[PDB]
């Protein structure tokens, strides 16, 4: 099990799960696109195989809107767990 | 059924399981540490098991390790002799 874990870690370091890891290490502000139209601008704390995330300094962005209407809303949250199926594309703004 | 039962009475030091002179002559792997269920106990023959296997075939009194008590005259010692045949050599007497 331990060996497997190690292998996984190595893979992450090497492949497409490296960037996220790096970000986590640095703890920079990052944005995430999500299935339900939620732009999650937040500070990453945890990371795993599934791309679930523990989040601090959380700032989501969406639009409560029953047509025709145009409103842009966003809320601050202190600490927030996140599920991975939601995640479409994570990004890092320098 | 025509009992085939076999035991050799001479050497107690012959094992319990033996092939008697009388008998006709007749891609992938599992994890290590996986073994038979009783593989941990090494020997399947024990010092008593010879005798125990013998007792397992006996007339009434001996095959049981538990029982009640009888009067001394309710034990029939000579009853077993005349139920079985006399053999031959004996005189008519």
């Amino acid at each position: 099990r331990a060996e497997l874990e190690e292998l996984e870690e190595f893979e992450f370091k090497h492949g497409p799960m490296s960037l996220i890891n790096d970000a986590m290490v640095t703890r920079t502000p990052v944005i995430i696109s999500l299935r339900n139209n939620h732009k999650i601008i937040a500070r990453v704390k945890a990371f795993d195989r599934h791309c679930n995330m523990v989040l601090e300094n959380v700032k989501e962005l969406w639009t409560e809107k029953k047509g025709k209407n145009v409103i842009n809303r966003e809320r601050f949250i202190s600490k927030l767990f996140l599920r991975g199926d939601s995640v479409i594309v994570v990004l890092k703004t320098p | 059924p025509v009992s085939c039962i076999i035991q050799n009475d001479e050497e107690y030091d012959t094992p319990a399981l033996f092939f008697d002179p009388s008998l006709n002559p007749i891609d992938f792997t599992l994890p290590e540490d996986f073994a038979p269920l009783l593989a941990e106990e090494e020997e399947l023959i024990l010092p008593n098991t010879k005798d125990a296997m013998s007792l397992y075939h006996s007339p009434f009194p001996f095959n049981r390790t538990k029982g009640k008590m009888v009067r001394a005259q309710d034990v029939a010692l000579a009853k077993k002799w005349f139920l079985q045949h006399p053999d031959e050599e004996y005189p008519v007497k």
Binding site: - | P1, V2, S3, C4, I5, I6, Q7, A16, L17, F18, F19, D20, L23, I26, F28, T29, L30, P31, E32, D33, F34, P36, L37, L38, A39, E40, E41, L44, I45, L46, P47, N48, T49, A52, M53, L55, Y56, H57, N63, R64, T65, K66
Partner: protein, 485 residues
């Protein structure tokens, strides 16, 4: 005087499995299978049945403390007083009880015990006109004998699925004292012998056409059903299909790795000898010789089995029987190997072709049942029937025809009788039932006066069907009389 029978309903042994749930299974034709058990003398057939019943029923009034404990075999099927005294089976007697396979599906099964003595081959054939599949019970010691050869030939011949039981395995360890190696050689020499007679087919422990049992000590294990308890609690779910087939037959094992290699490395025992027999002997040898301290823990640490303080004190045999049954649970190994070996689309259509006109005409369209024998259950004469179509009921008037008549095949063809009662055959007792369905064998009171020996039973509202319904043949009996008094 004639028989030892239970004539009061309050005294019928209560059944744990809830009879009325069994009556539900009677409708679905694919759910039930009728299986008769055949074999040579004293192979354990009747004492095999005696396992299924005691496991099925919660309390039985005919159990003495002596037959419960071990010493004397209970024989439920040998109801007749002659059979008790004669020490033998004369007339065939079955039971109808439901039992679950290993998958936990619950099927209703009708057993028929055939008498094994050569002279009673009348009722082995009466068991091959009912049994869908048969169990053939073989002694390991006596080997496969000539009268065994003729049974498998009659079964191959009569379109009946075969499954073998090699019984009386204590008589190998306890009587002969064969070492674990010498035992497996003889399990081959039999199983290797069995295949030769069976033309164009092979049996094997792995395919679950062969069952290993000893009925005196009361255990039956199928190498599939043995693994699912213990060795399947160890290694991952995906390897079991792979493991089991790697168990029997010449493959060896070193550490974690099956290698068909000659016997190389150091130790040599085949995979069967090491993973089955040797842990079987160690069960024996320890349940006799070892202390009740050492043994009590080894059952907990390995088999996940616990002996009560009562169990700790019995006697050598009654204790050994208690250890084996507590290791090998209520018997799903037999019920499984029976279930998967019966394919009705290879058979049920061919069998009826052998019992009557091949056809097929008058599809459905009639209540059509086959009357086998007139069987004496206590104080009355019943007819043992099998239903190939339609639904019998109490009070119906049905046409009945002898098989002396069907050699021939509008008014004048008609004897008629009511079907007055229909029971389920229970051994000691008979359980009342209002109706019957396709596939299940029952007992009718009131048909008996209309025939002798075999008969055909039909009820029809259509003249077209009346023309097209096929009548059964005179039943075959494997022997001819030849002995005159």
């Amino acid at each position: 005087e004639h028989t030892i029978f239970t004539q009061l309903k309050k005294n019928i042994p209560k059944t744990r499995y809830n009879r009325d749930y069994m009556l539900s299974m009677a409708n679905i034709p694919e759910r039930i299978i009728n299986v008769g058990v055949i074999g040579p003398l004293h192979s354990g057939k009747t004492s095999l049945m005696d396992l299924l019943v005691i496991d099925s029923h919660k309390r039985i009034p005919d159990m003495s403390k002596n037959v419960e404990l071990g010493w004397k075999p209970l024989r439920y099927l040998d109801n007749l007083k002659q059979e008790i005294d004669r020490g033998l089976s004369i007339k065939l007697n079955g039971s109808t009880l439901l039992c679950t396979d290993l998958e936990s599906k619950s099927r209703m099964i009708n057993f028929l015990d055939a008498p094994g003595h050569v002279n009673f081959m009348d009722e082995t054939a009466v068991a091959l006109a009912a049994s869908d599949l048969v169990l053939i019970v073989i002694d390991v010691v006596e080997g496969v004998t000539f009268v065994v050869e003729q049974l498998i030939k009659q079964s191959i011949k009569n379109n009946v699925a075969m499954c073998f039981v090699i019984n009386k395995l204590d008589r190998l360890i306890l009587d002969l004292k064969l070492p674990p190696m010498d035992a497996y050689l003889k399990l081959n020499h039999i199983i290797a012998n069995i295949n030769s007679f069976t033309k164009g087919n092979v049996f094997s422990p792995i395919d679950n056409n062969i069952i290993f049992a000893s009925t005196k000590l009361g255990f039956t294990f199928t190498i599939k059903e043995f693994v699912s308890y213990y060795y399947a609690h160890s290694i991952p779910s995906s390897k079991i299909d792979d493991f089991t087939t790697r168990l029997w037959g010449s493959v060896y094992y070193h550490k974690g790795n099956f290698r068909t290699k000659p016997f190389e490395n150091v130790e040599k025992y085949p995979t069967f000898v090491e993973f089955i027999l040797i842990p079987l002997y160690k069960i024996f040898s320890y349940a006799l010789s070892m202390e009740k301290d050492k043994l009590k823990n080894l059952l907990r640490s390995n088999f996940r089995v616990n002996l009560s303080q009562e169990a700790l004190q019995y006697d050598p045999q009654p204790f050994l029987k208690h250890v084996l049954q507590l290791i090998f649970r209520q018997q799903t190994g037999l019920v499984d190997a029976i279930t998967r070996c019966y394919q009705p689309f290879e058979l049920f259509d061919n069998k009826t072709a052998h019992l009557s006109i091949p056809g097929k005409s008058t599809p459905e369209g009639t209540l059509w049942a086959h009357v086998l024998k007139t069987v004496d259950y206590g104080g009355a004469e019943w007819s043992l029937v099998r239903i190939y179509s339609g639904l019998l009921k109490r009070g119906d008037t049905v046409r009945i025809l002898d098989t002396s008549q069907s050699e021939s095949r509008e008014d004048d063809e008609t004897p008629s009788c009511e079907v007055e009662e229909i029971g389920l055959l229970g051994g000691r007792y008979v359980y009342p039932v209002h109706e019957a369905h396709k596939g299940q064998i029952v007992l009718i009171k009131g048909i008996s006066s209309a025939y002798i020996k075999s008969a055909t039973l039909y009820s029809v509202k259509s003249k077209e069907d009346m023309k097209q319904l096929k009548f059964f043949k005179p039943l075959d009996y494997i022997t001819e009389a030849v002995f005159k008094i």
